[PDB]
Amino acid sequence: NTFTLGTKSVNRLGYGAMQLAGPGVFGPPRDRHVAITVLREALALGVNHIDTSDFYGPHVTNQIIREALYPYSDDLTIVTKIGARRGEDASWLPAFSPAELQKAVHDNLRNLGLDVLDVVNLRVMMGDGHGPAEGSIEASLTVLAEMQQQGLVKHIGLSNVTPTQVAEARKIAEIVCVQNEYNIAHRADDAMIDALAHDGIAYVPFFPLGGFTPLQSSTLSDVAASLGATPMQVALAWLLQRSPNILLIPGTSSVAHLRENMAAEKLHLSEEVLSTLDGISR
Ligand SMILES: NC(=O)c1ccc[n+]([C@@H]2O[C@H](COP(=O)([O-])OP(=O)(O)OC[C@H]3O[C@@H](n4cnc5c(N)ncnc54)[C@H](OP(=O)(O)O)[C@@H]3O)[C@@H](O)[C@H]2O)c1
Numbered sequence: 001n002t003f004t005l006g007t008k009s010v011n012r013l014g015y016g017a018m019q020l021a022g023p024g025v026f027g028p029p030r031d032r033h034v035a036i037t038v039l040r041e042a043l044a045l046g047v048n049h050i051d052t053s054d055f056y057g058p059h060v061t062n063q064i065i066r067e068a069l070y071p072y073s074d075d076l077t078i079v080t081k082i083g084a085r086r087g088e089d090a091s092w093l094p095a096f097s098p099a100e101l102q103k104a105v106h107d108n109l110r111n112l113g114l115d116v117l118d119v120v121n122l123r124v125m126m127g128d129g130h131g132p133a134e135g136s137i138e139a140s141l142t143v144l145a146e147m148q149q150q151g152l153v154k155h156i157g158l159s160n161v162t163p164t165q166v167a168e169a170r171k172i173a174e175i176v177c178v179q180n181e182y183n184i185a186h187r188a189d190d191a192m193i194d195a196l197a198h199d200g201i202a203y204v205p206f207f208p209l210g211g212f213t214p215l216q217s218s219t220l221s222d223v224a225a226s227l228g229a230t231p232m233q234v235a236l237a238w239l240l241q242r243s244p245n246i247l248l249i250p251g252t253s254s255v256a257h258l259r260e261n262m263a264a265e266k267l268h269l270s271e272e273v274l275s276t277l278d279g280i281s282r
């Protein structure tokens with residue numbers, strides 16, 4: 001169904017735009033035409049939330065969204081993210097000096113052809129690992145805060161953050177969404193999802209099917225089979241019923257998968273099936 005993200009209601013089945021680019025989200029996509037077709041069909045299918053970034057393929061993913069969908073329905077929310085830059089070797093690097101965050105915000109503005117960004121995710125990176133790690137984010141957020149006052153950005157969100165960081169952030173500005181790694185097999189954020197929900201802040205999982213062990217994978221497959229669904233559909237449907245503040249942004253460069261992902265809304269998970277799925281992580 002729906003969720004109010006900032007001041008705009010969004011269909012909880014949205015679209016991640018990260019597959020509309022070359023391998024490693026770098027360079028142009030396989031086929032620009034199919035990318036355009038996928039975006040247009042998504043809208044036609046009821047998508048009104050698109051997740052993107054200007055460091056996808058540097059810039060080209062945003063330009064495709066523009067070529068395909070400008071001028072945008074005013075029902076449409078485009079969410080983008082800043083905080084990283086791309087090496088010319090496809091590498092992802094820290095990019096959170098005021099100059100870089102300001103340039104990133106304007107890059108988005110130009111490539112999407114917008115006058116203001118709906119939602120900007122600040123994407124955190126601490127330590128030498130990849131995921132959530134402790135450290136103050138005040139400096140970056142203050143910069144995003146100022147561009148909000150200037151009217152370049154309506155709403156601020158967070159990406160790849162620990163519960164403490166969210167807590168530090170929410171004293172500097174309003175946070176409308178948190179975007180973290182989370183799926184059936186990786187449920188460390190469970191507590192935060194419920195707490196966010198109670199404050200009306202959305203939570204946005206990525207890797208819906210990522211990093212499953214064979215046993216984890218075969219269980220999901222078993223469940224799909226018995227339901228006449230695909231594993232992807234089961235994964236999305238589980239996310240949908242897990243909490244009402246959860247927004248899905250599955251990415252795909254294929255129209256068939258798009259329609260299939262969107263069909264996941266029709267799938268209804270019995271208690272016995274949820275029992276099996278909740279045990280995948282345990
Ligand atoms: N903020 C961050 O730190 C960050 C990091 C990662 C992702 N994200 C966002 O989150 C979104 C989701 O990305 P993700 O990393 O969670 O992974 P994902 O986009 O859900 O997975 C992408 C892969 O799944 C395949 N796929 C999609 N639907 C399928 C289906 N129905 N059947 C079989 N395969 C299917 C795609 O292949 P096909 O193209 O051939 O269908 C593609 O190879 C992204 O679009 C991006 O915007 C953000």
Ligand SMILES: [Mg+2]
Nearest residue numbers: 016018019251
């Ligand atoms: Mg993706």
